[PDB]
Amino acid sequence: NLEPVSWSSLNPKFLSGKGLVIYPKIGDKLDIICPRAEAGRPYEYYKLYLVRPEQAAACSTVLDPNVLVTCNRPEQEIRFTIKFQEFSPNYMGLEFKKHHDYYITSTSNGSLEGLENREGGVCRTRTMKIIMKVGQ
């Protein structure tokens, strides 16, 4: 198991320049909680895409990136558990393997108006990208 990652604009683990770097070994669990209705009633709506390093640097996604998980409900604690095995019950396989890199980001505008804004968004403004270089 690993430390779950609360995915909100009010989370310190996202370094201002490097994002959130993780070095998970094979066979580890890792939760990615999208936040509940936060105390402050700031409805936080995101849409996460499994992406490649190049377009994660450019912070743009074409139609081919698959909507990994969407934080639709504000009240319900929607989540996304990860085990770094090869097989995943997700469309398009999403093989984790070993000695690879895995980047998770959101390009969305903070609210539901830009929920499906895929052009820019949080990927560069707040740099909320989870980068997982598995292995040493």
């Binding site: 094979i26 066979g27 139609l63 081919d64 698959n66 990994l68 998980v69 969407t70 639709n72 929607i78 989540r79 996304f80 558990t81 085990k83 095995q85 090869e86 097989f87 995943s88 019950p89 997700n90 469309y91 398009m92 396989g93 093989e95 393997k97 070993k98 539901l112």
Partner: protein
């Protein structure tokens, strides 16, 4: 007709793993994935894909096709005897295959294409479809299916054999197939009848129409169906393609047809919003109408907005394939290796269940075991009900991934350990 049919704990399935059927590759980069198994009249057909550093189906350089027999070894349990093992001549172009064991022989129905994304940007006239057939003595032979002389009940634009097995009825083969069509010709009374929270974006009629769309082609829809192939001893083929009933539609997904207990059972993997077991016996063939069960206890894990036990309509994609096998028609009993997890594909459990209650269950492994899909076939052996399941396992970390075969018996008495 003499086995445990009640709610009980600690069942004795007499579980044993079979390792000598599926080959073991010396190369660590090989992924053995997507196993299929169909048993009929004491003979079986096993299929799986081999790829290099990737476990994706069309991303496979070898596709193994195995034919074999059920044999008594005096062991008081059925044993798998591998008879023939061949590689597909067009393996590097295989998009999908479905096994059928007909008349004690193996038959493999495959779709071959230059484009692994052919289902998103092409049509079936641009692809080829083959039947590879063989037994214990004859060399395997592959014949091209004449899709030109095919009759269809609707304006389908594409199709692939997608499922865990097919069926032989007389001289006709009935293979599960997933079709692609680019116009909304469907109705959704069942989905539109749900009393769920209305999503702020779209209406329930829109939600239900769009949930049938391909997640990679907003203009295409994936509809399940069957293919009926009649022929005169591999001559003068007559091929028909019929779609599934519009009652309780679910997004196109690999299915199965099985001859069990004098009936024909259809299974459909739940890859959309209805995360509960889609299965039923076939009433009519045109349209392909399975009598859908009202099962309230069998589901499957998945990440995202539709995890295990999700019921409400939602534009979702993802899930796991988990065959079922009937044990008693009068008692409405079934067995299946399902995944005991809400979102992750892990912890396979042999589960004997009602339509309304789970009867008994047992984990396959004491340690956590990754399993993406399971298939199960049951049969009478020594006047007793026995079952064989195949799991696409990853017991070693990463590396050489390979499925596993397990054999077990339905408990004679309840609560024996």
């Amino acid at each position: 007709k003499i086995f445990c049919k009640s709610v009980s704990k600690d069942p004795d399935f007499r579980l044993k793993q079979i390792d000598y059927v599926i080959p073991v590759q010396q190369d660590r980069s090989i992924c053995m994935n997507n196993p299929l198994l169909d048993i009929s009249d004491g003979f079986f057909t096993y299929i799986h894909y081999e790829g290099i550093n990737s476990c994706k189906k069309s991303d496979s350089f070898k596709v193994l096709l195995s034919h074999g027999e059920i044999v008594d070894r005096g062991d008081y349990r059925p044993s798998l005897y591998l008879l023939s093992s061949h590689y597909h001549p067009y393996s590097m172009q295989v998009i999908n295959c479905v096994p059928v064991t007909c008349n004690q022989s193996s038959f493999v129905f495959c779709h071959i294409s230059n484009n692994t994304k052919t289902l998103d940007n092409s049509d079936y006239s641009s692809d080829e479809y083959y039947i590879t057939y063989f037994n214990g003595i004859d060399r395997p032979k592959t014949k091209k299916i004449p899709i030109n002389n095919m009759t269809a009940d609707n304006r389908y634009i594409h199709f692939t054999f997608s499922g865990g097995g097919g069926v032989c009825l007389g001289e006709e083969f009935i293979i599960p197939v997933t079709t692609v069509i680019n116009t909304d010709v469907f109705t959704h009374d069942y989905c539109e009848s749900f009393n769920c929270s209305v999503q702020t974006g779209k209406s329930l009629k829109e939600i239900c129409s769009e949930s049938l769309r391909s997640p990679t082609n907003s203009s295409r829809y994936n509809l399940n169906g069957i293919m009926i192939i009649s022929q005169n001893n591999m001559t003068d083929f007559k091929i028909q393609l019929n779609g599934i009933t519009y009652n309780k539609l679910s997004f196109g997904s690999p299915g199965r047809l099985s001859k069990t207990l004098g009936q024909v059972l259809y299974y459909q993997s739940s890859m959309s919003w209805d995360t509960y077991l889609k299965a039923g016996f076939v009433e009519k063939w045109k349209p392909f109408t399975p009598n859908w069960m009202n099962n309230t206890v069998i589901s499957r894990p998945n990440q995202g907005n539709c995890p295990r036990y999700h019921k409400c309509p939602e534009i979702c994609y993802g899930g796991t394939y988990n065959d079922i096998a009937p044990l008693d028609l009068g008692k409405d009993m079934y067995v299946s290796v399902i995944l005991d997890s809400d979102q992750l594909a892990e912890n396979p459990e042999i589960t004997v269940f009602n339509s309304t209650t789970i009867l008994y269950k047992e984990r396959v492994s004491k340690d956590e075991l990754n399993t993406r899909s399971t298939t199960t076939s049951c049969f009478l052996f020594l006047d007793e009900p026995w079952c064989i399941s195949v799991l696409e396992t990853n017991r070693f970390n990463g590396k050489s991934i390979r499925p596993e075969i397990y054999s077990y018996k339905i408990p004679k008495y309840c609560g024996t350990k």
